[model samples]
Target chain A: NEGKALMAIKGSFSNLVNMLLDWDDVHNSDLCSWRGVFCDNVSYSVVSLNLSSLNLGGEISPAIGDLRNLQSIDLQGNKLAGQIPDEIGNCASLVYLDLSENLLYGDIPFSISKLKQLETLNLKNNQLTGPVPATLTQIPNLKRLDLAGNHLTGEISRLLYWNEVLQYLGLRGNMLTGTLSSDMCQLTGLWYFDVRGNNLTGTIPESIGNCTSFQILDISYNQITGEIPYNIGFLQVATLSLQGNRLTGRIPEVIGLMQALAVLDLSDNELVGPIPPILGNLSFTGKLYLHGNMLTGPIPSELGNMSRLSYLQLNDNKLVGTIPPELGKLEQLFELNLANNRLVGPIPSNISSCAALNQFNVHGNLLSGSIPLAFRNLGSLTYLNLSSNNFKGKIPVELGHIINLDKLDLSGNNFSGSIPLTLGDLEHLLILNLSRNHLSGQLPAEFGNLRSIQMIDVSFNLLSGVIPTELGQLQNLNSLILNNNKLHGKIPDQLTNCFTLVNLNVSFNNLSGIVPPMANFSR
Target chain B: AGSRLPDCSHACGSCSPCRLVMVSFCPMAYKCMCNNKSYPVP
Candidate 1:
C-alpha cells in the first residue's frame, strides 16, 4: 500500500514525463534501490523520501500522506505548483518536512498542527501567502522553522510563543506586519533569528539580551522604531545587523559587551551621540559599519586597538575632532571612510602604515595639512578622496607610484604649487579631481600618458600656462574641466583629437584663441 | 548523481549550512549562510 502511495506521488509530477523510471516495481522490487526512497528493513515500509533538487515539476500528490511510516520528506528545489495537501499532516511519524524553494501557493494547511512529531519545517522561498499559522508554534517539538522569502502576509503576533524552544527561526523577506512583542527570553535555545525586510514596527524587545546563545540576529530593514535596548549587549552574537531602520537615540555603550561580535552593522538609522569607545574592545570584529547616522563627538582613539578590523565605515555623520593617529595600528584595515563629517585636523601620517589599505576617503571634513608623503607606502591603494578639506601644500608626487589608483580626488582644498609631473604616470586613473585649489603650475605635459583617464577636472586654480597639447592624447577623456584658471595662449590644435570628449569647459580663463571646432563641445 | 558537499557537521564559522535536508546527500551544493543568505566560509 505504501509503494502504491509512492507510485501515486510519482504520477503527480507529470511535467517530468519519464522521471524516476527506476520506481518500477516490475524490475527493482526493493524500494531501497529507488534513488530517493528509503524503507525500514524490518517492515519494508517507506520511511523517508529525499527528492530534492531534481528539477521535477507539477503538483505533489495527496497520496503522500498515505505513507504512514514516513518520518522525513524533502521535496525542496522543485517546480511543484498548487497548494500543499492537508493530508500531509496525517503521517504521524513525520518529523522533518521541507517543501521549500518551490512554486507552492495558497494557504498553509491547518492540518500541519496535527503532526505532533514534526521537528523541522521549512517552506522558504515559496509563493505561499496568508498569515503564518499560529498552529506552527503549537507544534510540541518544532526546533527549526523557515518561512522567509515568501509573499506571506498578515501579523506574526502568535508566531513567537512556541511552547517548545526553537533553535533557528527565519521569518525575513516577507510582508509580515505587527510589532516584535514576543518575549524572546523564553526561547533560550535560539541560535539564529532573522526577521529583516518586513513591515514590522515597534522597538526591539528589551528582553532580547536573554537569548545569550544567539549567533546571528538580523532584524534590519524594517519599520522598527525606538532606542536600542541596553539588554542587547548581553548577547554574544557573532553577526548582528540592525541597519535601515527608524531607530533613534544614542547607541547603547553596553553593546560593546558582545565579545563574540565579528560583523556589526548599525548604519542608516537616526541614532545620535558619540561612538562608544568600548566598541574598540570587540577584538574579533572584522567589519564595523556605523555610517549614515547623526553620531557626534571625537572618534575614540581606543578603536585603534581593534587589530582584526578590516573594513570600517563612519561616513555621513556629524562626528568631530581629529582622526586618532592610533588608527595606524590597523595593519589589516582595507577600506576606511569618514566622509561628510565635521572632523578636523590633519590625517595622521602614520595612517599610511595601513599596508592593506585599498580605499581611503576623508572628504567633506575640515581636515587640514599637506598630503602625507608616507602614502607612497600604500601599494594596494585604489581610491583616495581627500576632497572638500583644507589640506595645503603640493600634491604629493609619490601618489603617482600607486599604480593601482583609479580615482584620486583632492578638490576644494588649499594645496598650492605645481601639479606633480609624476601624476601623469598613473596609467590606470579614471577620475582625477584637483579643482578649487590654490595650486599655481603649468599643466604637466606628461599628462598625455594617462592612458585610462576619463574625467580630469582642474578648475578654479591659479595655474598659468598654455594648455598642454598632450591632453588631447587621452583616448578615454569624457569631461575635461579647466575653468576659472590663469591659463593663457591659444588652445592647442591637438584638443580636436580627443574623440571621446563629451563635455569640455575652459570658461573664465585667460585663453584668447577660438574654441576648437569639435561637434561635442559646450562652454 | 552527486559528489561530496561541504560538511554541515558544524557551522562554517558562525554561518550554518542551509537546506539541512540535503546535507546527507549533497551538502556541498547547500553551502553555508549568514543573514539568511550564502556567506563565504571565513
Candidate 2:
C-alpha cells in the first residue's frame, strides 16, 4: 500500500494525469491494479479512489491523507489547484468525499472533521473560502453537504446549530451571512435546503415548520425579511423559493397546504395582501413568480387553475382586476408577465388559448380593449407587448400570421388604422413600436421588409407617406423614428443602404429635399 | 461619399433626450438620441 503509490506520483501529478495513470505495471500491477485503485477484499487494503474526469492537473496530495484504508474519495472534474490538504483529516475511513469541479482554492480544510465516516461531502464548484468549519457539524454521520459555489463566509449559526443528521444542505453560491437561525427545526432530517445566491438574513424561522422532511426549500436571493411562517404549511417542498427578499406579510395562506408544490418564486419582494386564491391549490405548480412586489388585490382567478403552470410572473405589482379569462387555461404557457399593473379590462378572450405563447408582456397597463381577435391563437407568438394601453382598433391582420414575431410594442395607444401591412410579416423583427398612436396610413410600404429591424418607432402617429426608399434595405437599421408625422418625401437617397445607421429622427415631419449626403451619421 | 462618422460620443447613456425625429436622414446633425423617454418615442 505505497499509499496507492503516493496518489499516482505525488500530486503536481500532471504529466497528463501521469500518463493517464495506468500505473504502468508497477511491481506487477496489483495494488488493486492501480489507476484509481480500489482494493480491500479481505484486507487487501487500498479501498476506493476514483480520480474523476481525468484531465487531472495538480496539488491533491498528502498521500491522500495517508490512505488508512480509505472508504471512497473521488477527485472530481479536475484541473485541481491548491489548498485542500489539511491532510484530508487523515482519512479515518472516509465515507465518500468528492472534491467537485475543481481548480480548488484555499480554506474549508479544518481537518474536515476528521472524517469519522463522513457520509457524503462535495465541495461544489470550488474557489473555497474560510469559515464554514464548525467541525462540519461534528460529523455525526453527516448525510449530504455540498458547499456550493464557494467564497464561503461566516454565520450559518454554528452550522445550523450543529447539525442533526443533515440530509442534503447546499449553501448556494456562498458568502453566507447570518440570521436564519431559529434552531432551524434542528435540521430534522432535512431533505435539500439550499441557501440560494446567499448573504442570508433574518426571518423564516418560525421553527421552520419543524422541517417535515422538506423536499427542497431554497432561501432565494437572500437578505430575507419577515412574515411567512404559518408553519409554512408544514413543508411539502418541491421548491419553495423565497425570491430576492425583504419579504413582508401576506401570501402565507398556509401556502395552499403544499400539495407537493412545484416551484413558487416570490419574486423580488415586499409582498403584501390578497393574492391567495388558495393559489388554486397548486396542481403541481411550474414556476409561479409574484413579480417584483407590493402585491395588491384582484388577479386571483385562481390563477386559472394552474394547469402545470409555466412561468406566470405577475409583473411589477399593485395588481388590479380583469384579463383573467381564466387565463385561458394555461396550456403549457411559456412566459406571461402581467407588466407594471393596475390591470383593467380586455385581453381575456380566453387568453386566446395560450398555445405556448412565447413571452407576452402586458406593458405598463390599465389595459383596454382590442387585441383579442383570438390573438391569432398565439401560434407560438414571439415576444409581444401590448404597450402602454387603452388600445383601439386596426393593427391585427392576424399579426402577420405571427410568423415568429419578435418584439412588437404597440406603444401608448388608441390605435387608429392602416400600418399593418402584415407588419412586413415579422421576419424576426427586432423592435418596432407604433409610438403614441392614432396611426394613419402609408409608411407601411411593408416597411421595406423589416430585415431584422433594429429599432423603428413611428413617432407621434398621424403618419402620411413616402420616405421609403425601401428604407435603404435595412441591413440592420440602427434607430429610425419618423417623428410627429405628416410626412412628405425625398429624405431617402435609399437611406444610404443602412450601414447600421446610428439613430436618426425625422423631426416635425414635412421632411422635404436632399439632406442625403450618403447618410451614416451617429453624431 | 465622404464616409467617416460615429463619434456620437458615448452613445446616449440610457437615452432620454427627444425629437431629432429621425435625425434628418443622418448626416451628423447635432447629437440626436432616442430610446423612448415615455410618450414620444426615441
Candidate 3:
C-alpha cells in the first residue's frame, strides 16, 4: 500500500521507461506527488527515494522492501544491474543506502545487516563480489561504510563486532587479506581509514595508539610487516600513508610527536636507522617521504626544521653527509632527491636558498665541487640531475638561465669546458646529457635552439666540430648521440630533416657522409 | 664518508562532494596530464 511499493518502483526501470510519468498510482493518488517519491507528512509512509543520475535501468525491485517508511535510498549513477535486494532488510527505517556507480553484481546482501537504522552504506563502483559482510560489524548507526571499487575478497573481519558509531571506513581498491586488527584500534569514532590496494599482512597493531580519532590513515600498497609501532606517536593524522610496506624497525622516535602531521609517507620500506632528527619537528610537514630505505646516517641538519617543507624524498638511501647547508631552510622546497647516496661534500652554497626548487637530484653521489655559481638562483629549475658526481669545473653557463629547463643530466664528472653554448637557452630542452666528462668544445651551433629537443648525449669526451646542420632543424629530434668525440665533418645531409630520428649515433667520431636514409633513422 | 652511514636511534613522530546540508562541511556534491606520465611531483 505504500503506493504499491511506489508502483513497483516505476516497474523495474527498463530504459527509463517513460521516466516515471509522475510515478502514477492512477493519476498519482497523492503518494506525496510521486516523481522520486517522498511521503511521511502525517505518516503518509514511503519516506524518501531519489532516483539519482537517471539513466536508470533494470533490476533493483524487491518491491523495494515494501517501503515501510523507508528512510533514504538513492540509486546512484544508474545503469543499475542485478543482485542487491535481499528485501533490503525490510527497510526497518533504512537510514541511507547509495548504490554507487552501479552495474551492481552479486553478494553484498546479507540482508544488509538488517538495517537497524543504518547510517550510510555506499556500495561504490560496483561489480561487487563476496565476503565483506562480516555482518557489517553489527551495524549500530553505521557511520560511513563505503565499499570502494569493489570485487571485495576475504579476511578483514575480526573487530569482534563493535560498531562504536563507526566513521568512514572505506575499503579501498579491495582484495583485502588479514591482520590489521587491534580491534581496529577500537574505532573510538574512527575517522577516514582506508585500506589501500589490499593484500595486507600482519603487525601494525601496537594498538595504533588507540586511534585518537585519526584523520586519514592509508595503509598503502600493503604486505605490511613489523616494527613502526611506538604507539605510532599517539595519532593526530592528516595523511599518514605507510607507503609500499614491508616496514621494519627504528623510525619510531615517537614519530617526532605527530602534532597533527601532514603527509608523511614512509616510502618503500625495509627501513633501518638514523633519520630521527626528531623529524625536524614536523611543523606542519608538507610531504616528507623517507625514500626507498636502507637508510643510514648524516642528513640531519635538523631537517631545516621543516618550516612547511614540500616534497623531500631521501632517495635510495645509505646516506652520507654534505648536502645540508641547513637545506637553505626549505623555502617551501619542492622535490629534492639525494639519489644513490654515499654523498661527499660541496653542494651547500646555501643551495641558492631553495626558492621553491624543483626536482634537483644528486645522482650516484661521491660529490665534488664546482657547478654552483649560486646555481643561477634556481628560478624553479626543472629536473636537473648531476649524474655520477665527482664534479670538477666549468659546465655552468648559469645552466642556461634555467628557463624551465627540462631534463639536464651532467653526466659522469671531472668537467672541463666547451659544451655550454649557453646551453642553447633551453627552449624547454628535452634530455641533454653531456656524457663522460673532461669536456672540450664545439658542439653548440646554439644547439639549434633546442625547441624541445629530445635526447642529445655528447658522448665520451673532447668534442671537435662539424655535424650541426643546425641539428637538422630539430623536428623534435630523437636520440642524437655524438659518440666518442674529436668529431669531424659530413654525416649531416641536413640529417634528412631528422624526421624523428631514432637512435642516431655518430659512432666513435670523425664522421663522413652518406648514412642518412632517414626514414626513421635507426642508425 | 662519515663512517659509511646508517644509524637511527632517533626520534619518532608521525574532494568534491557538494551537499550543503546544514553547513558543517557539507558532503553532498562531488566532482596530472602527463605522457609516459611520470612527473612524480607536479
Instruction: Pick the winner on TM-score between candidates 1 and 3.
Output: 1
Runs in model 1 deviating more than 4 A are A1-81, A90-95, A438-455, A459-523, B1-42
Going through the candidates in order, their DockQ values are 0.04, 0.01, 0.02
- Ten consecutive residues with minimal summed lDDT in candidate 2 chain A? A2-11
Q: What TM-score is obtained for chain B in each of the predicted models?
A: 0.24, 0.23, 0.15
* lDDT at position A142, candidate 3: 86
Worst 10 residues of 1 chain A by lDDT: A156-165
DockQ of 2: 0.01
Q: Which candidate is the best by TM-score?
A: 1
Candidate order by decreasing TM-score = 1, 2, 3
**How do these models rank on DockQ, best leading?**
1, 3, 2
Top DockQ model: 1
* Native-to-model Cα distance after best TM-score fit, residue B17 in candidate 2, in Å: 43
DockQ, prediction 1 = 0.04
lDDT of 2 by residue, A451-475 (tens): 8989999899898977778778889
Overall local distance difference test of candidate 3? 0.80
